[PDB]
Amino acid sequence: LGEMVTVLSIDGGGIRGIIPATILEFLEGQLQEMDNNADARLADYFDVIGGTSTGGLLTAMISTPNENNRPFAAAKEIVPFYFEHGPQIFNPSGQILGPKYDGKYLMQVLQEKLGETRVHQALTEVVISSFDIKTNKPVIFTKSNLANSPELDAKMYDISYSTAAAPTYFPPHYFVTNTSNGDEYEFNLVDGAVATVADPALLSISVATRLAQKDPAFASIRSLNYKKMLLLSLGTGTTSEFDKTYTAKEAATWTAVHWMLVIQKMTDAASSYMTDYYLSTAFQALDSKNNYLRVQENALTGTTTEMDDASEANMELLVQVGENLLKKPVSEDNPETYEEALKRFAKLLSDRKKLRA
């Protein structure tokens, strides 16, 4: 168990980020109780912490060092963050030409809570996604892969704004770093969901697998041995309820405007289903299905669907969805609930740390 690699992955979902945050508040509290340490943080138990958009914001806030070289935010401080800053991040600009939001508040609160910290300072391996619209390539921010190409040692707020810079919602982000030669290196980044990874769990598994080639602490998964891998992937919920879906017939006359307000939700939903299929296939092939815990909501209803509904009523509903998810079964045939599976996971995390110490 001591040689096992631990990976945490958080999906994007806008305001639906309350759901994995509620899930992480429960898990961090389990670890704090078991280890008799109220200062116990997720970055102390996870080797890799991956996140896209709001999952990336979360990743950055629990990986960035504070004044004590401790993770900046506790898991229980994330739903209050979403409740406090969510209505101001998701406050419409009112402008006719451009995105729904100016991104001014989102950047300001990120700057405020992340400071001048760089990715090389992360307390664990981070995997925060984006897509560069100038190089037309995904740009994945890691603590590793910095030895080669130091121009990726970007500010945590530039990484965090970029991962969440959703086309039509917020404007793309432009920022500069410096290469080894001292010359400028340009970034023109949009949301990580564009880079096809709304669900960054497979990307996070690949980063760990690639690190296993150059790091002895990751050596146990060196030849795809996911038997020696613990993966916690967290979703922001999907929906199949006919009230919130569409027919091919009604969509026959849909213009470019209607599609744009709906494709991100579709690709993000598809990203969840495909990445889960890839990972289940791989873990079930090695007879290690329980090494991969995917905490996801499949029946979002009402306002709970929308990514930018930062009203008090929708935020309270998202908490309720998160708290009901804990009592919901892991599978259709498995009676084991998520709260129970998360206790088993916390125990494994707790036991691996002790042995490594």
Numbering used by the authors: 25 to 381
Task: Quote the authors verbatim.
Previously, the crystal structure of a recombinant patatin isoform, patatin-17 (pat17), derived from the tubers of heartleaf nightshade (Solanum cardiophyllum), has shown this protein to have a modified α/β hydrolase fold containing a central 6-stranded β-sheet sandwiched by 9 α-helices along with a catalytic center composed of a Ser77-Asp215 dyad. This fold and active site configuration is reminiscent of the human cytosolic phospholipase A2 family of enzymes, but it is distinct from the traditional Ser-His-Asp/Glu catalytic triads found in serine proteases and esterases such as chymotrypsin and acetylcholinesterase (AChE), respectively. Recently, interest in patatin and its homologues has been heightened by the discovery that a diverse group of mammalian lipases, termed the patatin-like phospholipase domain containing proteins (PNPLAs), encompass catalytic domains with sequence similarity to patatin.
Currently, little is known about the inhibitory potential of OP compounds such as DFP and MAFP toward patatin, beyond the fact that DFP inhibits the insecticidal ability of patatin. Consistent with this observation, we found DFP is capable of inhibiting pat17 with a 20-min IC50 of 182.1±11.1 µM. This negatively charged oxygen was within hydrogen-bonding distance to the oxyanion hole (being located 2.6 Å, 2.7 Å and 3.4 Å from amide nitrogen atoms of Gly37, Gly38 and Thr78, respectively) and 5.1 Å from the Oδ2 of Asp215, which together with Ser77 comprises the catalytic dyad of patatin. Furthermore, the phosphoryl oxygen of DFP was located within hydrogen-bonding distance (2.8 Å) from the Oδ2 of Asp215. Crystals of the DFP-pat17 complex were grown in a solution with a final pH of 5.4 (measured at 4°C). This is expected to be similar to how the oxyanion hole helps stabilize the negatively charged tetrahedral intermediate of a native substrate during catalysis. Taken together, these observations suggest that the protonated amides in the oxyanion hole of pat17 may play a role in the aging reaction by stabilizing the emerging net negative charge on the alkoxy oxygen during the dealkylation phase of the aging process.
